[PDB]
Design a protein around this ligand. Structure first.
Ligand code: VO4
Ligand code: VO4
Ligand SMILES: [Cl-]
Ligand SMILES: [Cl-]
Ligand SMILES: [Cl-]
Ligand SMILES: [Cl-]
Ligand SMILES: [Cl-]
Ligand SMILES: [Cl-]
Ligand code: NA
Ligand code: NA
Lengths: 129, 129
């Protein structure tokens, strides 16, 4: 599923991401824009052979099982395929573990480089929340 | 689809029913409980031959077309089948027309008899909104 901006903002808010670990909703929308262009089915293979999955490009090196990342962990205890669903629940639940794990949203390279420090409220403007 | 109480409250809030025409969200949850027991597929045939459809039991006499209510109107400009979808949008959009049409939520007999005047906030307690 490819979300519209405000559509995804509402869904993310429904799923409790607004102010989660202190990150306002626009941080999460911005991260999703630049990680996946709002596409739940986004996948990208990393140099190390791991793959990133879903609207927040969660990495099979650590967070999900895809059966083809030798030596990896599955810290969210989910198949990576679950992160490609139209239903963003598995992605959100795994993102909550990631953001709680010490480095906050810096785990998302695109957030650090493109969203951090910026006017992230812009990402939720015009949206009914 | 049979909604859970808090699930339906969130959906109704997403769809702008909270405070719509001055009716707080718990009015709408209460009405849905007693009209349909939260079941989008609820149907009931009236004495006059019209049928009521969906989570808010909208009547084919006035509001939707079902092809079998002679002499009726279709004021929401929708097939009655649309009011049975798991996606409550058509029901909500048609309910907004009904509640705006002069008698407010009194159009729903179950609301008038069972919800009106009561502690409707109870219907949204324990819910993340
Ligand atoms: O394509 V990935 O480099 O974001 O882990
Ligand atoms: O079953 V109906 O009497 O609510 O219009
Ligand atoms: Cl994801
Ligand atoms: Cl693996
Ligand atoms: Cl942090
Ligand atoms: Cl309905
Ligand atoms: Cl008809
Ligand atoms: Cl009124
Ligand atoms: Na893995
Ligand atoms: Na009709």
């Amino acid at each position: 599923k490819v979300f519209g901006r405000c559509e995804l903002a509402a869904a993310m808010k429904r799923h409790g991401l607004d102010n989660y670990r202190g990150y306002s909703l626009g941080n999460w929308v911005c991260a999703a824009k630049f990680e996946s262009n709002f596409n739940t089915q986004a996948t990208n293979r990393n140099t190390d052979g791991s793959t990133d999955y879903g609207i927040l490009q969660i990495n099979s090196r650590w967070w999900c099982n895809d059966g083809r990342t030798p030596g990896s962990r599955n810290l969210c205890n989910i198949p990576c395929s679950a992160l490609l669903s139209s239903d963003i629940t598995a992605s959100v639940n795994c993102a909550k573990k990631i953001v709680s794990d010490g480095n906050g949203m810096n785990a998302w390279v695109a957030w650090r480089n493109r969203c951090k420090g910026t006017d992230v409220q812009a990402w939720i403007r015009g949206c009914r929340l």
